[PDB]
Amino acid sequence: NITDMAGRSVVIPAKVERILLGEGRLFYAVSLLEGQKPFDRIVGWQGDFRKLDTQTYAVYKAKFPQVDNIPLIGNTTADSISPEKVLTLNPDIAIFGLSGHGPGKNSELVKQLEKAGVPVVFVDFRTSPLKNTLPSMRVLGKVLHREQQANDYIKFYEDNVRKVTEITSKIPADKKPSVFIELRAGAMEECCGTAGKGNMGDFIDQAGGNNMAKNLLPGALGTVNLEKVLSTNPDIYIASGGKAPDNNAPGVSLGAQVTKEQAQSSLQTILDRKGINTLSAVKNGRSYGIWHNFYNSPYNVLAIQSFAKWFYPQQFADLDPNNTMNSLYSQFLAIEPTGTYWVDST
Amino acid sequence: ENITDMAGRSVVIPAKVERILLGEGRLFYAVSLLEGQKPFDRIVGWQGDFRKLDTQTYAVYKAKFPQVDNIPLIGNTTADSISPEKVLTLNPDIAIFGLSGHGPGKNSELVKQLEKAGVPVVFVDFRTSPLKNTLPSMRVLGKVLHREQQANDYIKFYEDNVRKVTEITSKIPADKKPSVFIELRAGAMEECCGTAGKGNMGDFIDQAGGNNMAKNLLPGALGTVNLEKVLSTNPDIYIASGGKAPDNNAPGVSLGAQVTKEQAQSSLQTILDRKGINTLSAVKNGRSYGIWHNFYNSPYNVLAIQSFAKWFYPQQFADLDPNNTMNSLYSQFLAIEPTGTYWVDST
Amino acid sequence: ENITDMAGRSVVIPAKVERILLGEGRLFYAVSLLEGQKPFDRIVGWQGDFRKLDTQTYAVYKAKFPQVDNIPLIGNTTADSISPEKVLTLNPDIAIFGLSGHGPGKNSELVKQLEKAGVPVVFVDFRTSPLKNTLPSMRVLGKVLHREQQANDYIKFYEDNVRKVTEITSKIPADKKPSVFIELRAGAMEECCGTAGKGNMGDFIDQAGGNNMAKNLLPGALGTVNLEKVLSTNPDIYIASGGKAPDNNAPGVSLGAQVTKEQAQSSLQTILDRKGINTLSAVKNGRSYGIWHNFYNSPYNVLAIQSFAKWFYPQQFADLDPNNTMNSLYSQFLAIEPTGTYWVDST
Amino acid sequence: NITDMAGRSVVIPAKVERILLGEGRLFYAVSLLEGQKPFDRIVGWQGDFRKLDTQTYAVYKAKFPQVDNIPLIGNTTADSISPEKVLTLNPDIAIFGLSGHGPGKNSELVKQLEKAGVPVVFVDFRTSPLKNTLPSMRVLGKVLHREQQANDYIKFYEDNVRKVTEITSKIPADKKPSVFIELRAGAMEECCGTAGKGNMGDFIDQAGGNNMAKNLLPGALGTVNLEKVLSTNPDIYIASGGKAPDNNAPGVSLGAQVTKEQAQSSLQTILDRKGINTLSAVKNGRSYGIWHNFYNSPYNVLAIQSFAKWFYPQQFADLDPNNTMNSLYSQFLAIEPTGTYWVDST
Numbered sequence A, D: 001n002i003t004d005m006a007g008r009s010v011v012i013p014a015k016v017e018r019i020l021l022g023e024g025r026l027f028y029a030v031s032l033l034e035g036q037k038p039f040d041r042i043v044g045w046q047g048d049f050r051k052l053d054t055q056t057y058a059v060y061k062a063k064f065p066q067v068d069n070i071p072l073i074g075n076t077t078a079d080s081i082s083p084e085k086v087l088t089l090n091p092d093i094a095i096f097g098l099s100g101h102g103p104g105k106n107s108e109l110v111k112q113l114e115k116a117g118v119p120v121v122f123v124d125f126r127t128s129p130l131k132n133t134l135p136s137m138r139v140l141g142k143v144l145h146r147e148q149q150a151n152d153y154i155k156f157y158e159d160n161v162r163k164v165t166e167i168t169s170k171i172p173a174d175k176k177p178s179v180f181i182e183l184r185a186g187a188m189e190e191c192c193g194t195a196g197k198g199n200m201g202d203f204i205d206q207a208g209g210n211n212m213a214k215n216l217l218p219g220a221l222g223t224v225n226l227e228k229v230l231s232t233n234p235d236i237y238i239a240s241g242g243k244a245p246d247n248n249a250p251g252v253s254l255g256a257q258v259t260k261e262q263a264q265s266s267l268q269t270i271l272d273r274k275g276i277n278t279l280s281a282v283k284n285g286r287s288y289g290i291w292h293n294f295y296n297s298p299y300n301v302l303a304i305q306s307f308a309k310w311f312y313p314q315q316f317a318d319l320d321p322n323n324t325m326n327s328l329y330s331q332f333l334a335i336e337p338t339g340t341y342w343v344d345s346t
Numbered sequence B, C: 001e002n003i004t005d006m007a008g009r010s011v012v013i014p015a016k017v018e019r020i021l022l023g024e025g026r027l028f029y030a031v032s033l034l035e036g037q038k039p040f041d042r043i044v045g046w047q048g049d050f051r052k053l054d055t056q057t058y059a060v061y062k063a064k065f066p067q068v069d070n071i072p073l074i075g076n077t078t079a080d081s082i083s084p085e086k087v088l089t090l091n092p093d094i095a096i097f098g099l100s101g102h103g104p105g106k107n108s109e110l111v112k113q114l115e116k117a118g119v120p121v122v123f124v125d126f127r128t129s130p131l132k133n134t135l136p137s138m139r140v141l142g143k144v145l146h147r148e149q150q151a152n153d154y155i156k157f158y159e160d161n162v163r164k165v166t167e168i169t170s171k172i173p174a175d176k177k178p179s180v181f182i183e184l185r186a187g188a189m190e191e192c193c194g195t196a197g198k199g200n201m202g203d204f205i206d207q208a209g210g211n212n213m214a215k216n217l218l219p220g221a222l223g224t225v226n227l228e229k230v231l232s233t234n235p236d237i238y239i240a241s242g243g244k245a246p247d248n249n250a251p252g253v254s255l256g257a258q259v260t261k262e263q264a265q266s267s268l269q270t271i272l273d274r275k276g277i278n279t280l281s282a283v284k285n286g287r288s289y290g291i292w293h294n295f296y297n298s299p300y301n302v303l304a305i306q307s308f309a310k311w312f313y314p315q316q317f318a319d320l321d322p323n324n325t326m327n328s329l330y331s332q333f334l335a336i337e338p339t340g341t342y343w344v345d346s347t
């Protein structure tokens, strides 16, 4: 038996072959365990990975066209999941997130699955990445019978994060740069989405930054008004996005099918917005883009490294997130790394 | 009949208004120009900023209108302290909010609640972009409160009294303009120095033909510049804002309805005697002044634009008198008598 | 409604409170600022530290309120002496506890018992992290005791009176600051010398622009530094804390409501005449002072921050008088008259 | 009475009223001593200040038109100095530089002046700034009877340098960025002029940088070929210039009459040159401009600070060399600071 991220006891199945993904992008944690056979044990998933990660999807489709035939249990919201379609896939395990675009610990679907005799595991990369990322992988390892892959990934992760924390854990608060992260910048109805005590805030903390929204918000995600950002006038501005290159909607283009030219061109649009464009950080060129889906992925060590190099350029001159990304893919994944997951303003 | 507010949103003009909700208490100043001798007749409730952050002007209105104490306070001095429940049970027929300040903004939940309740919401602004927004705000308030005459009268008064300044300062070339720093609530904040960028009192500096040293240091209307940056820039003219009550020995400039010239100058001097500030060229040369803080969010801000022009070019505006303008303002529009000191020069 | 206490825990605000339990008796000081002329009206019971470790302030309240003797003592002066049974039979509707001190902490069994009994528990702090916690503690007590006005009034008073110090000391560079050692309950502990690290009275030294020699010797808010370490560091300024009653022949400094200047000066001198202490440069040079110990856990601690600044920079704070601040505090908030000596200088 | 920078003993004159400047830009050291009467005691000077510092000249001329009437003893080279014109000015002291566009310790003119009974003082801000800048000011103080001004300036300088060395003195060599400084970049016949163990090299050393030319060159100044720079591929590129805005000759525009936008546009031209534009430092945006005349001025504490903030951006985020310049001008000089003495690439 194991304790999941909701504190609940889960009896590990003897053999797993029918994994249900409550949130599609929980695939990222699964991908680190399944080696060259990524989709072999997925009976169905939330449609967020296919619809909100179109780039990473297309790359896996070109090498694995059977991905199109994995059933979508819903669209991009917990409320759109048919519990009936879920149960007819006869899962032998269901992986859910404490938060996100899929069911949480108190949903009806979780109770239905408990009545059906199906083990449910809660992980978390989104609410409390710092507390939860590694424990989540340890647990997924045990319940999916991929302890070796999991232990390998934890060692890789700890080592690559320790490269940052060995330095930033000793830096005193008054020497840290102030940071604002604008999630899905440009692309929300009301500006400005950001992270508080949690989510990408954990990355700012680890990378030795000072999140200006840490004390403005009670939860992991929330909203701060444009004028509050202008008034705080933080040292460093970071925008997250995952927009596909050939999408004329507002947002930052980043992901597997994005070139540096397009990442720079679209970040600039984001930085040219009224108000934003007068920020000291934007004028001084301390303005950056990070791929949004790192907000819910155990690949988040790539962002902690990208934030650290932006917060202390020379102290992390020698650190290369692209090499960490390449080591990750070659050691663990079944596709080749492409595209741009981070960008600096021209 | 609809109107476009200061947030760009369309608002349907109520047929009759008798229950005005003030998102920020000091938005009363705009309302006071419209309500003549019956200032508080139509106010169902307001933010507590006017009563708690404008104690002097409050006390003067209370002595003539004791019923002001019975207007409900929907919160203290911050948007986050407003109970949306208390707000809705006052059954307002209009809510007036500010684009910025100590009350809810355009994206607050309370604004959405009120829209669900069928209550028209109007955004005004005297604080973020006074130059763009002050007159349009009054025009709009005129239409939605059915006081078009009072509003048009006040716009004419305002335009004329500002034109007295801009007719001169609009033709002055940049290289003849004095550099200016305004230290908001000088001495009274934890961390020095609050100031205004391209907005707020910065708009007044611009209009009065001054050169705001913080214009390009800051992205927003308000922000913070460090003492050493001020010392380094060493601007021609120093201005401190305050609204401290006379009998308060804490640091801050005393200005307002119950402040005498002696208290305003004694307390400005304390502010100018602070380490660092006291080595400014502007302080040593006596180009140091005090302005009443609440002009940072009031359509009476024409008084500050004029005080600024007279400090920026003393001889060219020798003949201009802001005290005459305040008196014309009060007598024409208000229901109280002008008292106290709203600005001061160092001696 | 709900609020966050000083332990990070959410507390549901009772609709009406009439049975307040004080985990530490001297938490009364925070309550006294809210209860006006009816100080003891809502206290069902308290730890015996206020009655037994604050005999002077107790006696003054007893003479005006003899019913104070009938408030139940839930224990003596240590968390371990509190009977949880006596506590629960008082049927409290709220319990106020301190993150640290002579009463239960956040992990005690009594706190869990009360949670099982459906009784809200609120953690405040004036002792571990006064700088971070004093004002937030008062705001919180305001909300849960339905005295938001009194609390907000006291915060404004406090901020203003501290700002009188910090406006000056916040700009002073480290190399111009005096070194300071504070000896808590000097002369009265078994092993010399108790003091404060990064917390407790250390926060006051920091704010008053001093350099606490024990800041980096100690991990916690309280600890112990050896006499020889003090002698070796030989700090600029020596401060002794005490609260000993005048007619108490035990060792320590006499300070409090029933102490005269001469009893405070004479007893400080005994403390300064002790072997080792008496060779300190600060003692020989007369930069030696006494402060009332209980300021180590009281929102009246603004009086200590002000006494410290005036000892650290005598001429820069010549004009500041902590006695006026105490009198303004008492008259505005309390139900007794200020008496005695809360601070003393060596002759 | 005092030992100059050439090791020679100079007899302090009882009263000085006729100062001869071997190199015009030695005026900068004099200006720190003469308060509001900068030109009162100058009998004549080399034409380098008037002809190679046209901007700083024009600013002093607008307040002091009598500067145009100070005699020019030559143009911009030691060989163009008429010793006859020099001697008829009847100087009572001559200030010369160990190196530069004026006579050195072995020149004939120095011997002529010794025969004429005129005290000669050697200073140095150019060959060995680190060893010589402060001793030079101490000496000038004594011989010009401005000991107070000199001691005031030394304290100011030491304090403002200590702001840098407190941090960079504890950085180990292997964490330091490699740096190349291209003096009068774009403006020489043959690329690339630079500094070795001396001149602006001393500033790189102090600011915790690693001068790639330190061991390529024997002297304070020299030349390294473009290909050697490309091959070393240093972390940080710095170009010096002092070109006037309205001068369309090649080089970087910096000085009292230069705006930031003109300094950025002209630095960019310099960075767009063949070879230079493939440097990692240029592509990564670690490319900067510094005002050339800091290569021979006791105001050089401004460049040391500008270099440290470029070498360690976050560790010196709170340091402002512009506030330092302003404290310098207000405390010591008779004119108002204007223009751009340093620039970052867009």
Ligand SMILES: N=C(N)NCCC[C@H](NC(=O)c1cccc(O)c1O)C(=O)N[C@@H](CO)C(=O)O
Binding pocket: A076, A077, A098, A099, A100, A101, A183, A184, A193, A194, A221, A295
């Ligand atoms: N399209 C929707 N209606 N909901 C989206 C899903 C869940 C929601 N998402 C976010 O808040 C969010 C914020 C910033 C950036 C993102 O990518 C986001 O997905 C959400 O998290 N809701 C909370 C509270 O209900 C939760 O599920 O815990």
Ligand SMILES: N=C(N)NCCC[C@H](NC(=O)c1cccc(O)c1O)C(=O)N[C@@H](CO)C(=O)O
Binding pocket: A052, A184, A187, A188, A189, A190, A242, A292
């Ligand atoms: N809690 C909400 N209602 N909205 C916040 C999240 C929902 C929605 N998110 C996306 O469209 C999205 C796209 C790519 C990756 C993601 O994680 C996403 O969450 C959203 O942000 N909607 C905007 C309007 O488009 C909004 O509601 O502000």
Ligand SMILES: N=C(N)NCCC[C@H](NC(=O)c1cccc(O)c1O)C(=O)N[C@@H](CO)C(=O)O
Binding pocket: A227, A228, A231, B077, B078, B079, B099, B100, B101, B102, B105, B184, B185, B194, B195, B222, B296
């Ligand atoms: N007491 C508080 N914690 N907040 C007050 C809320 C408004 C805040 N005020 C200022 O920035 C300010 C600055 C100088 C002088 C003043 O009188 C001020 O009130 C504020 O303006 N917030 C901005 C952005 O947060 C806004 O609402 O647009």
Ligand SMILES: N=C(N)NCCC[C@H](NC(=O)c1cccc(O)c1O)C(=O)N[C@@H](CO)C(=O)O
Binding pocket: B053, B185, B188, B189, B190, B191, B243, B293, C159
């Ligand atoms: N946005 C903030 N966090 N601070 C700026 C304003 C908050 C507060 N304002 C006032 O007290 C105030 C008083 C009169 C008139 C106003 O318009 C006011 O805003 C403030 O300044 N607090 C101080 C704490 O003493 C501070 O922020 O340093």
Ligand SMILES: N=C(N)NCCC[C@H](NC(=O)c1cccc(O)c1O)C(=O)N[C@@H](CO)C(=O)O
Binding pocket: C077, C078, C079, C099, C100, C101, C102, C105, C184, C185, C194, C195, C222, C293, C296
């Ligand atoms: N009578 C006892 N045996 N213990 C008393 C408990 C409180 C204890 N007090 C001190 O350590 C102290 C030190 C110097 C001066 C004082 O007035 C003191 O009261 C205490 O603080 N305990 C801490 C650590 O154990 C706590 O409760 O967190």
Ligand SMILES: N=C(N)NCCC[C@H](NC(=O)c1cccc(O)c1O)C(=O)N[C@@H](CO)C(=O)O
Binding pocket: C053, C185, C188, C189, C190, C191, C243, C293
């Ligand atoms: N936790 C401990 N063991 N000692 C430290 C404090 C215990 C005791 N404190 C007091 O008597 C006291 C008096 C007035 C006000 C206070 O806050 C007090 O704590 C104490 O000091 N004990 C001495 C023995 O006398 C000691 O332990 O050295």
Ligand SMILES: N=C(N)NCCC[C@H](NC(=O)c1cccc(O)c1O)C(=O)N[C@@H](CO)C(=O)O
Binding pocket: D076, D077, D078, D098, D099, D100, D101, D183, D184, D193, D221, D295
């Ligand atoms: N105008 C000339 N033809 N010669 C000037 C003589 C000084 C010469 N200067 C430089 O080489 C120099 C190099 C880079 C950047 C500069 O600003 C320079 O002035 C020089 O230093 N010559 C040597 C050897 O005679 C010396 O003076 O020690």
Ligand SMILES: N=C(N)NCCC[C@H](NC(=O)c1cccc(O)c1O)C(=O)N[C@@H](CO)C(=O)O
Binding pocket: D052, D184, D187, D188, D189, D190, D242, D292
């Ligand atoms: N020793 C040499 N022959 N040349 C190097 C310096 C001589 C000349 N110097 C300047 O133009 C100059 C301008 C401003 C400030 C200075 O210190 C200067 O030296 C020079 O650079 N000539 C170039 C021809 O463009 C060259 O020799 O490459």
Ligand SMILES: [Fe+3]
Binding pocket: A101
């Ligand atoms: Fe999302």
Ligand SMILES: [Fe+3]
Binding pocket: B102
């Ligand atoms: Fe305000």
